Amino acid sequence: HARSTGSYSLVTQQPLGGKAQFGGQRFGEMEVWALEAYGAAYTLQEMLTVKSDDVNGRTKMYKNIVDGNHQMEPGMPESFNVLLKEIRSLGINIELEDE
């Protein structure tokens, strides 16, 4: 099973799962721990946002790679926004303090 780009989930904006669905391999918690053990920061960040959830990041990455430029825009993962919306729906305020 191999995937470069394809359909994404309609709720979490993440790649699908399973060979029959042409999904992508899951990067579990232990993989993240191993990456942090190596000191992997840029690789982990590019595996977390610009590859899975950041729609604008994914489009920018695709355009840059087609154009021959290897640069990453971290953007903002949509899973965190979904979690914030769910927490807000629970009657509990959560927000990002810029200051």
Partner 1 sequence: EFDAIKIALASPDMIRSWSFGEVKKPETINYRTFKPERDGLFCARIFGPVKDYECLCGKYKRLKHRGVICEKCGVEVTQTKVRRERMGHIELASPTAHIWFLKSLPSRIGLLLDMPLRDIERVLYFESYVVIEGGMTNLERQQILTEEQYLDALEEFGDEFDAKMGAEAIQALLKSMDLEQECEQLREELNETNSETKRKKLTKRIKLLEAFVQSGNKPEWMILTVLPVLPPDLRPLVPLDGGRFATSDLNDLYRRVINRNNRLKRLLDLAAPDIIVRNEKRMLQEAVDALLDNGRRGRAITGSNKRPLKSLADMIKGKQGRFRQNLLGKRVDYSGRSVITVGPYLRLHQCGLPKKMALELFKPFIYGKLELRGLATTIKAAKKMVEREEAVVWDILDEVIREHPVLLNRAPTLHRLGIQAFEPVLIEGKAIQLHPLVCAAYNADFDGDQMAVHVPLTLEAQLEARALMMSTNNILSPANGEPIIVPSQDVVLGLYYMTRDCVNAKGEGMVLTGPKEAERLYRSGLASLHARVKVRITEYEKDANGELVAKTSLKDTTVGRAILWMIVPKGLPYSIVNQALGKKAISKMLNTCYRILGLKPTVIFADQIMYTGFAYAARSGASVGIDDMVIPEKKHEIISEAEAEVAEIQEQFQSGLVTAGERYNKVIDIWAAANDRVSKAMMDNLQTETVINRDGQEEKQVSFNSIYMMADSGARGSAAQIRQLAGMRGLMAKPDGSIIETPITANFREGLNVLQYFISTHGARKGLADTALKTANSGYLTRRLVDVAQDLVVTEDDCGTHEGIMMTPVIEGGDVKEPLRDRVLGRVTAEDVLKPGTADILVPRNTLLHEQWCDLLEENSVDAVKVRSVVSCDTDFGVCAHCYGRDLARGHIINKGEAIGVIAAQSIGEPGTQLTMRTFESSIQVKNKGSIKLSNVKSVVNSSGKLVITSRNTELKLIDEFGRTKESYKVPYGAVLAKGDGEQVAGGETVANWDPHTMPVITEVSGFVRFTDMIDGQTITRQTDELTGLSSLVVLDSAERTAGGKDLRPALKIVDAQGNDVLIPGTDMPAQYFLPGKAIVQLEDGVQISSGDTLARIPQITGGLPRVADLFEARRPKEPAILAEISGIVSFGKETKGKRRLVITPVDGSDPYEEMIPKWRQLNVFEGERVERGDVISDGPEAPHDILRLRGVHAVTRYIVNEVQDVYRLQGVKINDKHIEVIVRQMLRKATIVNAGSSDFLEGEQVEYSRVKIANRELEANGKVGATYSRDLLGITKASLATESFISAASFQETTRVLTEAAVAGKRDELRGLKENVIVGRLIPAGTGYAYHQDRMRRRAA
Partner 2 sequence: ARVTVQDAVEKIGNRFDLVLVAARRARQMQVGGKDPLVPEENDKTTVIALREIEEGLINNQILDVRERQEQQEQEAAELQAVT
Which CB, 11 or 37, lies closer to RNA? 11
Q: What amino acid is encoded at 47 in this protein?
A: M
CB of 75 to partner 1, least distance (A): 8
In angstroms, the Cα distances linking 37 to 31, 33, 85, 88 are 10, 6, 32, 34
- 84: which 2 tokens? 């914030």
Q: Under rule CB under 7 A, which residues in 13-42 are in contact with DNA?
A: 17-20, 23, 25-26, 28-30
Residue window 41-80: x/- pattern of binding to partner 2, with contact defined by CB under 8 A: -x-------------------------xxxx---------
Candidates 45, 53, 57; CA nearest to 8 is 53
Q: Which of 22, 27, 45, 73 binds RNA (CB under 7 A)?
A: 22
